Write a protein that binds this ligand. Structure first.
Ligand code: HEM
Ligand code: HEM
Ligand code: I5U
Ligand code: I5U
Ligand code: H4B
Ligand code: H4B
Ligand code: CL
Ligand code: CL
Lengths: 362, 362
């Protein structure tokens, strides 16, 4: 059954991929080679063209992503050649540097060796390559609560956080054959952070908020033609609401709305005053302003939905079925001000795609 | 098949209804009577208790409604006795008066004779008993675009609107046996309207916005135990976002955000300024303020979600399955500031319930 799933997925992917690449005539001979390779080795190896286009197709198929207009300009870095933890670390350091690109963010994915017998070659523990630690003990909450369990796991491995609200977690990953992951501190010169200030309200800096420039998701599995790339960190740029309406706002994250209300000079006493809504708008204006001022890429939710509409039109004109998750595509502020809110989307799963996988800790 | 559907639906409803009413022992004899009645007449007649509780269950089962905490205090008016259009008109006038209750809105439903052979006894054309007309011709848009087709149909029946932005549509309904509906102008003394002003920004009244106090949905079918009450207008009070984030804001409704931006003194030039979001917040603060100032019931989305959470807890403690439509329950502004956004809901259809039915015009 193993190899059968593999061969069926391989067939569908190659045919589709080669169609899109105008390599339709080469499908027959390539599939034959693959059939042998699977027969003899239990798996097959993607060409650089297949791997690159596969990762792009996977992005294009991500139902929850509003940023898909730009799927075809994804920068694919092939690191299937890595064998050592020093090589993995340096590849992750490099991904951060080249994706950051001095603020002009380049959507990038680095692809490590794939699973074999469902056996991982490289196992990344980080949720994102750059993320803040979280601590909770005896009433005392510090940092990002979403990072509490990973932070606790790192502190089992000999690492110790400073316990500021913005400790950078180290890279943490395990190699096949090793019982424990290794950890490496991020060189701070590689990490761009943005202090949050407001265009009009000088007091806003009293909150001493900041966020990191580049979200690099490092815990999802990229699946291409039956091959499971469990280690394939990718990044785009932020949509501002992710930071302003969720990471800094959620009660189970940084929970800053009451403090925002105070510094913008409004009462946080009555639901009917819509103080949370107003705080959310000003915090979100501040985030966009700050990223712009710092020269770091970011998109607002209005422009992002406008781009997503173009992606819908592109799919229709290319004759491709469009899939999407309405519940994730709508932005968490003013969703009815976007076209997304007013239509529906088929949430069918199409491969290649990115998938959740079980955490190696907890 | 007709009567079979009826008998099966009747059985399920009576058993459930009588359970809830502690009338469990009376189920057997009541179902026997019903079986005879269906056998002989092709239908059955609800007791006043059944009808009242049925309408309440139908509200409780409305997946899209955030206001369901209060399902058991619904005021049910039984007008199955009506036979003439004067009686229907006076019943609708009365519903408006008693539901309005001088501003202290009473959730009410008036129930007219049900369908027979799928044959309507009373056919209501209005979407809501109180609603503004809409006109569109030669570039010129006036009033509420959502009312354009009904307005056009009324003007086929001898009625003529003043063509202000807030013309009250007349009541319009058809009696069984009549080929055309009749129309009646609403007595203005019955209709409370609220001028929209802002608590802090005096210029806001320059927009000359207003809305009506009581939304009374008059085009949905109430289904109870296999009986189809196609004419059963109901009302609650508004959640403020319905007026501020949708009726006055949508581009295909009153489309007021650019004018809001201007009167609150902000530019409407850059997406990154979040001017639409800020305009939405101030317009929504204004709506809540104005309804409160006028002594007309309204709820903000934060309080409404807080009430809905209690409804969820009530269902769990009563041992009832909770059903809901996440896509409708989330408010159209700051949805992630409500608990609703962060959980999921089973969207299964449970009866009794309210259902869409085909419009009698267009
Ligand atoms: C170019 C800039 C991009 C923007 C602005 C963007 C925007 C977003 C946003 C706002 C989300 C929702 C995240 C959340 O609410 O937590 C999302 C989800 C997602 N994006 Fe994108 N994205 C971009 C690029 C990419 C790239 C380069 C990939 C992969 C190659 C990708 C794949 C995904 C996936 C898989 C999800 C779903 C995550 C999940 O289910 O947990 N996106 N995107
Ligand atoms: C007591 C105050 C009430 C509030 C604040 C409330 C709130 C709401 C809101 C905000 C919606 C969504 C409407 C939209 O977006 O267009 C809704 C939908 C609904 N409500 Fe309620 N509601 C209330 C009372 C009632 C009552 C009394 C009934 C019936 C007896 C009812 C039945 C429904 C139904 C059927 C829908 C769905 C309409 C559709 O699918 O088009 N609600 N409610
Ligand atoms: N939900 C489960 N697991 C799970 C638990 C907690 C968290 C998560 C994953 O969180 C998804 C989101 C958080 N909203 O992750 C952040 C994210 C994902 C994708 C894009 C994001 N933003 C961006 N702009 C980008 C990053 C990289 C490229 S673009 C940001 C998953 C399950 C439980 C049981 C079965 S599945
Ligand atoms: N959608 C269809 N029909 C359709 C077309 C246009 C409009 C509609 C119905 O609109 C539903 C909404 C508009 N958002 O109606 C307003 C509404 C409904 C329910 C509650 C509302 N607000 C309230 N607070 C209340 C009113 C009465 C009691 S509470 C307000 C239905 C279909 C097309 C094909 C199959 S179904
Ligand atoms: C397509 C989508 O279902 C549609 O825009 C819905 C979204 N959620 C909604 N929710 C409410 N309360 N009212 C609405 O009219 C809508 N519109
Ligand atoms: C339960 C619900 O699906 C959950 O709260 C979702 C809603 N939509 C979302 N949409 C985005 N973009 N990100 C999220 O984390 C969530 N959370
Ligand atoms: Cl994030
Ligand atoms: Cl309405």
């Amino acid at each position: 059954e193993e190899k059968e799933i593999l061969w069926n997925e391989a067939k569908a992917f190659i045919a589709a991929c080669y169609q899109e690449l105008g390599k339709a005539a080469e499908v027959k001979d390539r599939l034959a080679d693959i059939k042998s390779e699977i027969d003899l080795t239990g798996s097959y190896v993607h060409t650089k063209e297949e791997l690159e286009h596969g990762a792009k197709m996977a992005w294009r198929n991500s139902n929850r992503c509003i940023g898909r207009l730009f799927w075809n300009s994804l920068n694919v870095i092939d690191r299937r050649d890595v064998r050592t933890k020093e090589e993995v670390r340096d590849a992750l350091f490099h991904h951060i540097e080249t994706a950051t690109n001095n603020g002009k963010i380049r959507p990038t994915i680095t692809i490590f060796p794939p699973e074999e017998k469902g056996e991982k070659q490289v196992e990344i523990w980080n949720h994102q390559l750059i993320r803040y630690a979280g601590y909770e003990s005896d009433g005392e909450r510090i940092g990002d609560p979403a990072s509490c369990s990973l932070t606790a796991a790192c502190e089992e491995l000999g690492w110790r956080g400073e316990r500021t609200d913005f400790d950078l977690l180290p890279l943490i990953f395990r190699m096949k054959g090793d019982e424990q992951p290794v950890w490496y501190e991020l060189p701070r010169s590689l990490v761009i952070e943005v202090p949050i200030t407001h265009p009009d309200i000088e007091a806003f800096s009293d909150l001493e908020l900041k966020w990191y420039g580049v979200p690099i998701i490092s815990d999802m599995k990229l699946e291409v033609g039956g091959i499971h790339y469990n280690a394939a960190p990718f990044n785009g740029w932020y949509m501002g609401t992710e930071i302003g309406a969720r990471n800094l706002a959620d009660e189970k994250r940084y929970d800053k709305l009451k403090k925002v209300a105070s510094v913008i000079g409004i009462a946080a006493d009555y639901n009917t005053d819509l103080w949370k809504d107003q705080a959310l708008v000003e915090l979100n204006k501040a985030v966009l302003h700050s990223y712009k001022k710092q020269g770091v890429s970011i998109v607002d939710h209005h422009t992002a939905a406008s781009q997503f509409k173009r992606f819908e039109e592109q799919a229709e004109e290319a004759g491709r079925k469009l899939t999407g998750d309405w519940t994730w595509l709508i932005p968490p502020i003013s969703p009815a001000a976007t076209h997304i809110f007013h239509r529906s989307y088929d949430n069918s799963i199409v491969k290649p795609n990115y998938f959740y996988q079980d955490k190696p800790y907890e």
